[PDB]
Amino acid sequence: GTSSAFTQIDNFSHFYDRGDHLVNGKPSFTVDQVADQLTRSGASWHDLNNDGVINLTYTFLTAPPVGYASRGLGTFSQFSALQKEQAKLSLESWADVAKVTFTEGPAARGDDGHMTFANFSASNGGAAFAYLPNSSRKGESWYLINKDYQVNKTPGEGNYGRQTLTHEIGHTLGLSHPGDNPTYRDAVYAEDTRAYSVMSYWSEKNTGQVFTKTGEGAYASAPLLDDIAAVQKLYGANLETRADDTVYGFNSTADRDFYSATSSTDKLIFSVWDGGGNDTLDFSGFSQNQKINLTAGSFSDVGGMTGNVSIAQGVTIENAIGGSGNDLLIGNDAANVLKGGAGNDIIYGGGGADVLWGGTGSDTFVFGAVSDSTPKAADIIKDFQSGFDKIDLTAITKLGGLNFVDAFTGHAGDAIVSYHQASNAGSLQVDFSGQGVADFLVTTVGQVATYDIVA
Numbered sequence: 001g002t003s004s005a006f007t008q009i010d011n012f013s014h015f016y017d018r019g020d021h022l023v024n025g026k027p028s029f030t031v032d033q034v035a036d037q038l039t040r041s042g043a044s045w046h047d048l049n050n051d052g053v054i055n056l057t058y059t060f061l062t063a064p065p066v067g068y069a070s071r072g073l074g075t076f077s078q079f080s081a082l083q084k085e086q087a088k089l090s091l092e093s094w095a096d097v098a099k100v101t102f103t104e105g106p107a108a109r110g111d112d113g114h115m116t117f118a119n120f121s122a123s124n125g126g127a128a129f130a131y132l133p134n135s136s137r138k139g140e141s142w143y144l145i146n147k148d149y150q151v152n153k154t155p156g157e158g159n160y161g162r163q164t165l166t167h168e169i170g171h172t173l174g175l176s177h178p179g180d181n182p183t184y185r186d187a188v189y190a191e192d193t194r195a196y197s198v199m200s201y202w203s204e205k206n207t208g209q210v211f212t213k214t215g216e217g218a219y220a221s222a223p224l225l226d227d228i229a230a231v232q233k234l235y236g237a238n239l240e241t242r243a244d245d246t247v248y249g250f251n252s253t254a255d256r257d258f259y260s261a262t263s264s265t266d267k268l269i270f271s272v273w274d275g276g277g278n279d280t281l282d283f284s285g286f287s288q289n290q291k292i293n294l295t296a297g298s299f300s301d302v303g304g305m306t307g308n309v310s311i312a313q314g315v316t317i318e319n320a321i322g323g324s325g326n327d328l329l330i331g332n333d334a335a336n337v338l339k340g341g342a343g344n345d346i347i348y349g350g351g352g353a354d355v356l357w358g359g360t361g362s363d364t365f366v367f368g369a370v371s372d373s374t375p376k377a378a379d380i381i382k383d384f385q386s387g388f389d390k391i392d393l394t395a396i397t398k399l400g401g402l403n404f405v406d407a408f409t410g411h412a413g414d415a416i417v418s419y420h421q422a423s424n425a426g427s428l429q430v431d432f433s434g435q436g437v438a439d440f441l442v443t444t445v446g447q448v449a450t451y452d453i454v455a
């Protein structure tokens with residue numbers, strides 16, 4: 001029997017689990033399983049000049065290629081500057097995660113391949129299409145534009161015009177669509193929605209995520225969690241990308257339109273890829289109840305939306321800052337700095353010595369294991385407010401309570417609450433194993449009382 005606060009943390013940390021179960025009658029695939037699914041055609045570019053990176057060049061077509069007329073595409077036109085600008089941003093977002101480089105220029109001798117972008121006008125061509133890297137027309141992608149279909153004319157962060165570019169380019173890199181009029185009912189796995197992969201034809205609503213409301217459209221601009229794993233499986237991860245301390249979200253330093261927020265109404269949808277350093281997910285500008293998880297491969301509910309933000313497999317984000325709402329913050333095994341913000345927050349540091357800030361409001365610092373805060377690597381609550389904040393240990397004690405004493409007696413369950421009214425430093429020591437010495441330590445900036453502990 002643990003507290004309600006712990007249940008909420010545990011519940012959310014498992015809310016998006018994948019693999020070995022059925023979801024909507026369909027098998028749930030893990031990220032790894034999906035990466036095999038998205039690259040099942042076996043097609044990809046080869047490294048001809050041997051140097052561990054695929055060097056592709058691309059051209060914005062100026063004139064129709066030889067035999068163009070026979071394609072049935074109608075009037076040929078070239079990319080406008082807007083499209084070229086957006087195309088470069090999408091290409092960039094792929095280069096960021098996998099070892100693939102893209103350079104604007106004519107087909108050269110030392111390239112591994114060449115790509116072309118162009119527009120057509122005959123709707124019978126479809127909204128847009130690309131070719132796999134093992135076909136005669138490899139590297140080509142085409143975009144419909146006419147009076148009746150206008151989405152490719154104004155692509156921009158967040159709209160389908162931008163996702164199309166990202167989607168089609170993914171296809172030219174070798175990624176297949178999640179499955180082979182069809183609907184989500186025909187998908188092979190459960191996570192085949194736009195919430196996990198930009199290659200999917202189905203909306204996030206099929207998997208329960210909530211990004212927007214009828215009338216408005218919100219689309220991920222860059223590769224999502226499954227896309228990232230599928231492309232790195234193909235070309236290897238790019239560990240040089242943002243390998244220095246990076247901030248995502250508000251006050252962002254990632255220099256990418258899709259990782260950037262400047263307003264409380266912003267609708268973020270992204271998957272973090274990062275090379276290393278001490279990193280932060282800053283969601284301070286939002287006022288909605290958020291739920292942030294710093295676990296690699298996990299999802300978070302940000303800025304009033306659900307399952308819209310995730311962290312790629314093999315990535316470690318160190319810090320997270322909540323917003324004005326009553327948030328849940330979950331750390332990982334690294335030393336995390338977690339700031340709650342205003343509102344009533346539930347913070348779970350995890351393993352390692354964590355720096356925790358509750359901010360204003362009545363906050364709860366939850367602990368699920370003795371190994372979460374030991375004397376060697378002890379947590380520190382920089383702003384504990386006695387009489388308002390609580391230190392929840394129920395997941396450990398299971399509500400058996402603690403025995404507050406002045407000195408350890410050797411009986412398991414003994415706890416000592418100290419305070420140095422000069423440094424304003426307080427601490428909680430506990431002997432869970434009853435080995436006569438403290439095996440759990442939690443220090444704080446601010447006096448802690450015995451009634452501020454929930455055990």
Ligand SMILES: [Ca+2]
Nearest residue numbers: 047053054055
């Ligand atoms: Ca190469």
Ligand SMILES: [Ca+2]
Nearest residue numbers: 242244246277
């Ligand atoms: Ca970084």
Ligand SMILES: [Ca+2]
Nearest residue numbers: 276277279316
């Ligand atoms: Ca890092």
Ligand SMILES: [Ca+2]
Nearest residue numbers: 323340341342
């Ligand atoms: Ca908050």
Ligand SMILES: [Ca+2]
Nearest residue numbers: 340341343361
């Ligand atoms: Ca708070």
Ligand SMILES: [Ca+2]
Nearest residue numbers: 332349350351
């Ligand atoms: Ca931690």
Ligand SMILES: [Ca+2]
Nearest residue numbers: 349350352372
């Ligand atoms: Ca900890």
